[PDB]
Design a protein around this ligand. Sequence first.
Ligand SMILES: [Cd+2]
Ligand SMILES: [Cd+2]
Ligand SMILES: [Cd+2]
Ligand SMILES: [Cd+2]
Length: 37
Amino acid sequence: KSCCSCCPAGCEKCAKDCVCKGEEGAKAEAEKCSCCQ
Ligand SMILES: [Cd+2]
Ligand SMILES: [Cd+2]
Ligand SMILES: [Cd+2]
Ligand SMILES: [Cd+2]
C-alpha cells in the first residue's frame, strides 16, 4: 500500500518497512518526504 502521504505504494524505500514509519518530525501529511527521494 502507499503506506504514506509522502510516498506512493511503489516507494522501494518503504518496500522494506516504511523508512519513514517514524511519525515524529517526518510527518507524512507533508505529501512528500526527504528520505526516500
Ligand atoms: Cd513516506
Ligand atoms: Cd518512502
Ligand atoms: Cd512509507
Ligand atoms: Cd520517506
